[PDB]
Design a binder for this molecule. Structure first.
Ligand SMILES: Nc1ncnc2c1ncn2[C@@H]1O[C@H](COP(=O)(O)O)[C@@H](O)[C@H]1O
Ligand SMILES: CC(=O)c1nc(C(=O)O)cc2c1[nH]c1ccccc12
Length: 487
């Protein structure tokens, strides 16, 4: 039964559920808020099959809102803060949203959205101009309903990834396997609209406490870990580096930390290495996709082998991984090919688009869109996203391999390598490179470094020094923006 997930989370909630800016929130108080928000969403006439789009910041009420939406047998649709109004609006429509719930603090964006798409019901967590306040019940208990098709979440890329309640329950099990037994004091500075939100549920479910920050500032995270004696934190890779390289870090007390988790985007091995030294044996990397959820983790002990700094780790329990050719046949250990995944955590499919779902799923296996290989010890190494491979006359140049080499140089902090088409080379390799502090390395040294380590075909023809590598909304390297610089 689909309602089993929301109950699992609800059943877990301990003494203190959330801490943040304004102090603490007891389990009691959080439970209450779920019941309340649940009743209110039910009353507003939102039916089970349909989606509840949610626009909010990282607030404790937003944790309750998700859980309520899911308990009343609807699918949660977290509108990403960094997404454009046009992308967000497409999401509300395509997810079959019966409602837009929003926080007063983002009424501007709510208004903007409503001028672009129409939604039966419009509610808000507090008094607002453009919507009906929901925070306005007896000894009323939480009254669950079942989603017709068992969907807990729909989350967008522009496809809507539909995740089952079963899958989200499996993620709790995964979380425990990666992060330890509870309770956790888990610091979440990433948006609750996506993975942050699932981490919060995993945290509650295991009887721990969520610690919220609105955005990421290195000092803030450092104070928070010490003040709240946090055990866990999830950072984007860039944030890891900022935190590890911060001057206060050795002055600070982070003895509470059992896990500093990072992932979501490819990591810079040398910068990771540095973090593993500066922070303790607490570093853990996580690899997932929107479609696959969790796939693999690299443990703190894995981080103490330099060989493994180019890896994502061993697959998690119940996660089967296969490396495959263009044909579709299984390759041996050490071979490079497409990463395919079978697991309990994989998507059900792309919402109301089986055309696209079918080019991605095949026999229970999910094509992640990544390319990689396994080592002697069974750690997966990603050589590239499929889009990002550079082909030259029947040879694959994996852009991430070139970046690793470039970035090993002491004067290079970051690198994005792309192809542009060339009649005489097939594609010509190009590198945007971010230089250290106030260094001035020699393009030719970098070219040479690449040539010594990989070979002639890998050596970037052009090398542009840039102040930073542009990111996507999601915070991944925008290698399409970079491709354009060199055309
Ligand atoms: N730990 C990691 N190392 C390398 N790439 C990663 C990691 N975690 C996530 N990713 C990338 O994020 C991609 C998908 O992100 P998304 O488009 O948001 O699903 C994956 O296909 C990976 O290439
Ligand atoms: C494990 C991880 O870092 C991760 N990454 C992504 C990504 O999009 O890059 C997505 C997910 C990740 N973990 C998840 C768990 C449940 C659902 C989705 C995800």
């Amino acid at each position: 039964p689909a309602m089993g997930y929301a109950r699992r989370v609800m059943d877990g909630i301990g003494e203190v559920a959330v801490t943040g800016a304004g102090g603490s929130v007891t389990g009691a108080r959080l439970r209450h808020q779920v019941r309340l928000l649940a009743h209110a969403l039910t009353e507003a006439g939102i039916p089970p099959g349909r989606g509840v789009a949610c626009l909010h910041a990282n607030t404790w009420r937003a944790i309750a809102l998700r859980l309520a939406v899911q308990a009343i047998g609807c699918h949660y649709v977290g509108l990403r803060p960094t997404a454009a109004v046009t992308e967000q609006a497409r999401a509300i429509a395509a997810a079959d949203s019966a409602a837009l719930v929003f926080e007063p603090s983002v009424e501007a964006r709510a208004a903007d959205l409503l001028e672009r798409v129409s939604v039966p019901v419009v509610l808000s967590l507090g008094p607002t101009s453009r919507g009906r306040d929901i925070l306005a019940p007896e000894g009323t208990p939480l009254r669950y309903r079942e989603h017709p098709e068992g969907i807990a979440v729909v989350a967008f890329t522009p496809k809507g990834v539909a995740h089952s309640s079963t899958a989200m329950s499996a993620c709790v099990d995964a979380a425990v396997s990666m992060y330890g037994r509870g309770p956790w004091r888990f610091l979440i500075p990433i948006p609750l609209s996506d993975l942050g939100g699932e981490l919060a549920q995993c945290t509650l479910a295991t009887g721990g406490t969520v610690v919220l920050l609105e955005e990421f500032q290195p000092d803030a995270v450092l104070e928070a870990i010490e003040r709240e004696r946090a055990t866990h934190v999830f950072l984007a890779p860039n944030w890891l580096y900022q935190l590890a390289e911060h001057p206060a870090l050795p002055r600070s007390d982070l003895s509470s930390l059992r896990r500093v988790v990072y992932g979501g985007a490819p990591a810079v091995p040398s910068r990771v290495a540095a973090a593993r030294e500066r922070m303790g044996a607490v570093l853990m990397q996580n690899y997932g996709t929107q479609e696959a959820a969790f796939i693999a983790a690299l443990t703190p002990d894995d981080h103490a082998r330099r060989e493994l700094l180019t890896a994502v780790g061993r697959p998690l329990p119940h996660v089967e991984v296969e490396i495959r050719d263009d044909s579709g046949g299984t390759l041996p250990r050490g071979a490079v090919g497409e990463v395919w995944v079978r697991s309990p955590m994989t998507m059900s499919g792309y919402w109301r688009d089986p055309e696209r779902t079918a080019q991605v799923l095949s026999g229970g296996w999910l094509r992640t869109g990544d390319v990689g290989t396994f080592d002697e010890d069974g750690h997966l190494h990603l050589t590239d996203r499929l889009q990002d491979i550079i082909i030259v006359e029947a040879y694959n140049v994996y852009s991430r391999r070139v970046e690793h080499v470039l970035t090993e140089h002491p004067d290079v902090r970051a690198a994005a390598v792309v192809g542009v088409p060339d009649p005489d080379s097939g594609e010509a390799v190009c590198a945007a490179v971010v230089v250290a502090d106030g260094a001035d390395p020699d393009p030719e040294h970098l070219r040479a470094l690449v040539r010594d380590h990989l070979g002639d075909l890998h050596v970037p023809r052009r090398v542009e020094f840039v102040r930073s590598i542009p990111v996507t909304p999601a915070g991944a390297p925008d290698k399409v923006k970079v491709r354009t610089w060199f055309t």
